[PDB]
Structure formats: structure tokens, C-alpha cells
């Protein structure tokens, strides 16, 4: 029965891998949050495996198990970083719930009624660690999530570790895929259970996991209809409006047609998150703090000759520009929706 | 009671004017078709009246009673034209109903499922008159509507009459309003009861009535939401989808908020139909054949500096371009609707 076959292929992230030296099961299935949609698994391949090279070429997700990308960083932990990370400022988001919804501050102007559920607070790494200990101590409920681009102000050891990254392999991936420059390296340190709601980025990404475990649920760009992103001018642009813990099927009916590609990454794994692909990231429950460093690259320029029919991500590019252009042309981003509705009601819908 | 005051201002075209020499009432109210919406009257002014100059400047409709625009043409009738109009071909639409819905033939390609309710047939003016007599003779039901741009192939008398038009007055109107060139002069000869469904043109127009009477119902460009034009790529682009004889309030709910500006024009009257203004034209029932010659002018170019907020017609210009651009970018006009719906469903609606 094809329905039975499908219920099997929705094997999730699969069986938890058994760590070396029989150190027991890496993670438990009960450490995963429960959702209302099926998910097939993202392939776990070797960087030498031709299939992995193929998936990256067709802009499809893949977890590379042996890149040694951030090998020197696999020894990173709070104590190490606190001594070597430096004394620069670190962006740290604080929330009252596990969901850390991103919000662009430049766009909060056009939406006064928007009240962010988490707050950003600059601080020194030791303060962050301190604040991390305090919550643990007082057994509080407050949650933190450090997200900071790595810069000039990192200790010599951190700089040394950087040199030990497998630049040879990633530089080639950049060159062979025609990708633009490396724009940044986001350091992500979050508490257990922390969740980064579904969204898509406008850059290619090599998600290098360093400490703890993260469950990554991805969705193809052709599932734009099922994820309902906020209006482009909204501070939550590029994020999904659908609450995964409580989907409003009335407002977002197509979310019942959604199918994800999930996987759990651990220390040493590198997940390729293709540009435009939606992704939901969560630090496993009771798995301790997680550490990740990503690599963001500008995408390849638009081809000289356009082929048809257009690919999904191209339509996404187009829909985004339409909203932008309208916003500029009407002089007020608030008039975008009314115009669009007027344009389609009784005409195209 | 404001509701009572409003029910009075909806005086329609008003009291029928009494022609000179006590030749009885020009037209009867029973010669008008019944519709489901209210209509205030379009002003009837003298070209020397400063108000008329004002309405034209603010791109608002007005009927000019004394322009002498097509004075030499006021003697035109079937016999005269048949002798002088020439032997060039004349576009003549034939329909089985009073509604003559315009349809662009260049766009019939993108819509195979479209079957026009009227057919165009080139013929000589005498043939047209002949065919006009035949239907009258056989007492048939078929309807005709001659609509032809006046060209080089008109007799010397028709050319002579043209010279007698009040070019002085209209040339100034062109110059003072910054309008482009005169693109054409459409000759319209239709049978009694014939109707040209609501639509808007992308050119400024001076509707010069020559024979018989026409009821002109206009709607401001800000009533775009209530008229539901066909998709830009549709052969019926710029026409309203709403059947005035039978409004589908389920598909077109905002048609119940529609308010028109109507008037009845007769020989000697010149109606200014501002660019983008919607208009419904009908040759009064049992009023005989009607003759009109319009003057189409390209509009003034877009201002150097754009002011805000945008005027209604500017938003119409924008909505049109969006549909055009999308059509080009997706390579298939049929994909426009699906993209627009995807862009707004659960996002802006």
C-alpha cells in the first residue's frame, strides 16, 4: 500500500547513531519536539562520496560527516571560549519561551504594533556565561541564545583555531559552485530546547556543528505556499508565520501539505543548507548547551541566459522584488497589501 | 435625512431637455435600461463657463453643450455617408445580444477557452447599410455596430467636413492639458439599444455626439475595486467582468458600492471622458441609429516629480505594469494569477 510505504519513508532523522567506544546512543527520540507533519531524512554522506557533491550542485541539503571543517573548534566549550573568545560585545537574545523568532530592527519602524517576544542585549562573554550560570542556579525559566558574528576581536587561540579550519575543502566548494564571498561566521550558542522558527536565508550556508546536538528540519523552496512568510517589509521577513507548536489551519491551510527533510547534527557534522531552503533548528531537549558556527556565502549571480520554466527559488526572488518595488512606488509599505488584494480579488482568485 | 438627500442627488441624467421649436421631449426615461446602482448627473456646461475648464483640468467628466466641434458633421446620416464616406473597409461587429464586449484579437492566443459573443466583419459602407436594411426588412434580431477609425480613404466632402471641425478649441485643450497627439477618430454607428459594456481607455477622449442619443454612465478610476476588470493579458483587458444586466454579487461583491455619473448626449454635445475613467455607453431604446465620432489623445507624460499619496489612476497604472512585468518574467501569462495568489494568501489577505 503506497500509503504504508509513505508512512515508512517518513522515518524522521532515523535511528540515533551509536557513538565510538560504545558510548551509548548519541541522542534519544524523546529529545525531539513533536509536530504535525511528516519528514523524510536528509542523507548522511562522506565528502568524498560523489552523491554528496551532486546534492550540493543541485542545491539540495546534505550532511557531510567527515569534512574536518571546524576540527580545531571541536574542543570549544564555555570555559575555553570565555578565556579565548575575547572581550568584544556579544549579541544575546533573551526570551520567555523556547521560540526565538528573528526580527529585523531596521523594519520595526513600519510596524509599530509589532512587539518582539525576545530581547537582544549586548554583553561580554563572561557575563553571558555568568548569566547562564545564574539562571541554572536560580532554576529560572528565562532562555538565552547567543548569536554573534565572529570578528577581529577574538583571541589569538580562536584565531589560531580558525586557521585550522578545512579552508581547502570549503574554498573549492565556493569556487566550483560559483558562489560569492564569505560574508560571515555566525557563532550560535544556545540552551537546551531553544528553537529557531522556520525561515529561509538569502545566502548559501555550511552549518558546522560543534557542541551538543541540533535537529534541523528543512523544507524545499517550492513549499512557499505552505509556510506563509511574513510580508517582506515586516520585521519578521523571511520567517514563517505558522506556529509549529500550534498551526492555525484556518489562516494557513496549506501547512497540512508540508513535508520536511530532517536530520540531527552533532560535533563534526556539516549540514548544507541551500539558499532559499526553509529550516527549523532546535537544540534537543535535555541535551545541554549547543555550539555551532555557520558559513554564509553570497549566492552565484543570476545566469546570463534564463531558462524556463523558472525554478521555485527564482519565483521566490520575483515575489520578493514585487513587494519591494510596490513598497517603494507607493511610498508606504502599508499600502502594499491593499493594492495586491485589489489586483487579485475577483480577477485572479 | 441624509439617506433621503442622497436618494435625491441620484437624479440620474435628470429631466429630458426640451428641444428647440417645442419639438417635444428629446428622449424618454423609458428609453433607458434599468440597472442596480445609483447615478448622479454629469454637468452640462458651456465651453466658456470657467467650471467646464476646471473639470477638464482636474480630469473630471463634463458635457460641453456649445463647442461646435463636429458642426459640419451634424448633417451626417446613412445616405450622406454612403455617398461620401468612401469605399474603404469598415470594421463592423455583429452580435446576438445588445452587449458588444470588446476583445483584443492579439490576446486571444493566451486564452483559447475565450469565445467572443460578437464577430467582426470587414465590409463596404453600402454593404453595411444594405445589411442594416436587410435586418430591418426581415425583422431579424441580429445586431450590428460599426466602429472604424477614419482614414485617408474618405471622400472629399467628408474631408471637407473635417476641416470645418472646431480645431481651434480642441487644439487649445490639447496644448493646455499637455496631452500627446491625436491618435484617431473613431466613427461609431450603432443600432438602437446597442450597448458598449463598462471599460476604461488609456487615452483622453472628447466624445462628440452626432446623430441619435447616447446614455453615458461613467465611474471614477478609484472605483477599480467595484468594477473587476479582466486580467491584463486577457483579450477583454480594460473591460469590466461584471454583467450589468445580471451582477454576480458573489464573485463581485464590491459592485454594490458602485456609484456612477451619467448623462445623455445628443447631436451637438461633447462629453469629456477623462483617461482611465470607466464608462458604459448605450444607444437609447427605440431611438433609432446613433452616430458619434470620438477624439483620442495620448495622455500627458508622467510628471518629473511624483507627489504623494498617489492618485487612483496612478495606482491603476502600477497594477497594470505589475501584471505585464510578471507575464514577461514568468514566460507564460497563465502563471500570473497563481503567483499573485501565492504572494497574498495568508500573507496580505
Amino acid at each position: 500500500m503506497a500509503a504504508t510505504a509513505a508512512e515508512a519513508v517518513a522515518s524522521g532523522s532515523g535511528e540515533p547513531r551509536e557513538e565510538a567506544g560504545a558510548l551509548g546512543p548519541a541522542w534519544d527520540e524523546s529529545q525531539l519536539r513533536s509536530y504535525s507533519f511528516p519528514t523524510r531524512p536528509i542523507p548522511r554522506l562522506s565528502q568524498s562520496d560523489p552523491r554528496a557533491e551532486e546534492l550540493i550542485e543541485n542545491e539540495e541539503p546534505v550532511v557531510l560527516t567527515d569534512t574536518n571543517l571546524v576540527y580545531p573548534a571541536l574542543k570549544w566549550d564555555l570555559e575555553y571560549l570565555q578565556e579565548n573568545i575575547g572581550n568584544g560585545d556579544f549579541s544575546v537574545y533573551s526570551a520567555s519561551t523556547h521560540k526565538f523568532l528573528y526580527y529585523d530592527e531596521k523594519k520595526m519602524a513600519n510596524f509599530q504594533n509589532f512587539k518582539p517576544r525576545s530581547n537582544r542585549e549586548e554583553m561580554k562573554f563572561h557575563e553571558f556565561v555568568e548569566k547562564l550560570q545564574d539562571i541554572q542556579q536560580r532554576g529560572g525559566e528565562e532562555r538565552l541564545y547567543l548569536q554573534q558574528t565572529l570578528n577581529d576581536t577574538v583571541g589569538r587561540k580562536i584565531v589560531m583555531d580558525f586557521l585550522g579550519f578545512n579552508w581547502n575543502w570549503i574554498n573549492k566548494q565556493q569556487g566550483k559552485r560559483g558562489w560569492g564571498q564569505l560574508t560571515s561566521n555566525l557563532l550560535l550558542i544556545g540552551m537546551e530546547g531553544n528553537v529557531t522558527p522556520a525561515h529561509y536565508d538569502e545566502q548559501q550556508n555550511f552549518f558546522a556543528q560543534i557542541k551538543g546536538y541540533k535537529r534541523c528540519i528543512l523544507f524545499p523552496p517550492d513549499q512557499f505556499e505552505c509556510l506563509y512568510p511574513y510580508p517582506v517589509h515586516h520585521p519578521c521577513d523571511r520567517q514563517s508565520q505558522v506556529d509549529f507548536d500550534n498551526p492555525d489551519y484556518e489562516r494557513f491551510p496549506n501547512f497540512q501539505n508540508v513535508v520536511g527533510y530532517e536530520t540531527v547534527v552533532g560535533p563534526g557534522d556539516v549540514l548544507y543548507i541551500p539558499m532559499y531552503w526553509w529550516h527549523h533548528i532546535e537544540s534537543l531537549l535535555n541535551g545541554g548547551i549547543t555550539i555551532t558556527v555557520n558559513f554564509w556565502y553570497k549566492g552565484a549571480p543570476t545566469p546570463k541566459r534564463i531558462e524556463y520554466p523558472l525554478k521555485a527559488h527564482q519565483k521566490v526572488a520575483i515575489m520578493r522584488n514585487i513587494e519591494k518595488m510596490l513598497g517603494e512606488a507607493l511610498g508606504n509599505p502599508q499600502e502594499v497589501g491593499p493594492l495586491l488584494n485589489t489586483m487579485i480579488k475577483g480577477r485572479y482568485n | 435625512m441624509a439617506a433621503t438627500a442622497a436618494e435625491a442627488v441620484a437624479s440620474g441624467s435628470g429631466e429630458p431637455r426640451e428641444e428647440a421649436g417645442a419639438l417635444g421631449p428629446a428622449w424618454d426615461e423609458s428609453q433607458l435600461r434599468s440597472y442596480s446602482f445609483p447615478t448622479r448627473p454629469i454637468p452640462r456646461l458651456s465651453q466658456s463657463d470657467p467650471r467646464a475648464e476646471e473639470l477638464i483640468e482636474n480630469e473630471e467628466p463634463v458635457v460641453l453643450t456649445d463647442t461646435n466641434l463636429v458642426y459640419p458633421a451634424l448633417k451626417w446620416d446613412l445616405e450622406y455617408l454612403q455617398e461620401n464616406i468612401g469605399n474603404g473597409d469598415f470594421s463592423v461587429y455583429s452580435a446576438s445580444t445588445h452587449k458588444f464586449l470588446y476583445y483584443d484579437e492579439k490576446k486571444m492566443a493566451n486564452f483559447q477557452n475565450f469565445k467572443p459573443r460578437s464577430n467582426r466583419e470587414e465590409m463596404k459602407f453600402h454593404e453595411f447599410v444594405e445589411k442594416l436594411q436587410d435586418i430591418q426588412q426581415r425583422g431579424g434580431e441580429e445586431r450590428l455596430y460599426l466602429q472604424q477609425t477614419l482614414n485617408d480613404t474618405v471622400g472629399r466632402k467628408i474631408v471637407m467636413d473635417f476641416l470645418g471641425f472646431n480645431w481651434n478649441w480642441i487644439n487649445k485643450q490639447q496644448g493646455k492639458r499637455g496631452w500627446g497627439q491625436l491618435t484617431s477618430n473613431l466613427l461609431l454607428i450603432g443600432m438602437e439599444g446597442n450597448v458598449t459594456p463598462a471599460h476604461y481607455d488609456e487615452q483622453q477622449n472628447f466624445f462628440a455626439q452626432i446623430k441619435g442619443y447616447k446614455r453615458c454612465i461613467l465611474f471614477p478610476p478609484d472605483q477599480f475595486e467595484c468594477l473587476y476588470p479582466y486580467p491584463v493579458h486577457h483579450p477583454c483587458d480594460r473591460q469590466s467582468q461584471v454583467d450589468f444586466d445580471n451582477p454576480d454579487y458573489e464573485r463581485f461583491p464590491n459592485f454594490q458600492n458602485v456609484v456612477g455619473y451619467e448623462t445623455v448626449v445628443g447631436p451637438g454635445d461633447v462629453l469629456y471622458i477623462p483617461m482611465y475613467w470607466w464608462h458604459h455607453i448605450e444607444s437609447l431604446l427605440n431611438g433609432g441609429i446613433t452616430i458619434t465620432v470620438n477624439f483620442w489623445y495620448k495622455g500627458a507624460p508622467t510628471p518629473k516629480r511624483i507627489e504623494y499619496p498617489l492618485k487612483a489612476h496612478q495606482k491603476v497604472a502600477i497594477m497594470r505594469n505589475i501584471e505585464k512585468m510578471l507575464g514577461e518574467a514568468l514566460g507564460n501569462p497563465q502563471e500570473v494569477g497563481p503567483l499573485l495568489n501565492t504572494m497574498i494568501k495568508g500573507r496580505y489577505n
Binding site: 560571515s184 545566502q203 523571511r238 526572488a317 520578493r320 514585487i322 | 518574467a329
Partner: peptide, 17 residues
């Protein structure tokens, strides 16, 4: 022409600026 215009992309990510 306009097609390229509509295809051009941004570089926004899950970070400020």
C-alpha cells in the same frame, strides 16, 4: 531586461544588518 530586474536577489540572513 525586467526579468533580470525581478530575478536579482538580496543577501539577508538570520542576523542584524
Amino acid at each position: 531586461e525586467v526579468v533580470k530586474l525581478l530575478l536579482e536577489h538580496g543577501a539577508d540572513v538570520l542576523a542584524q544588518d
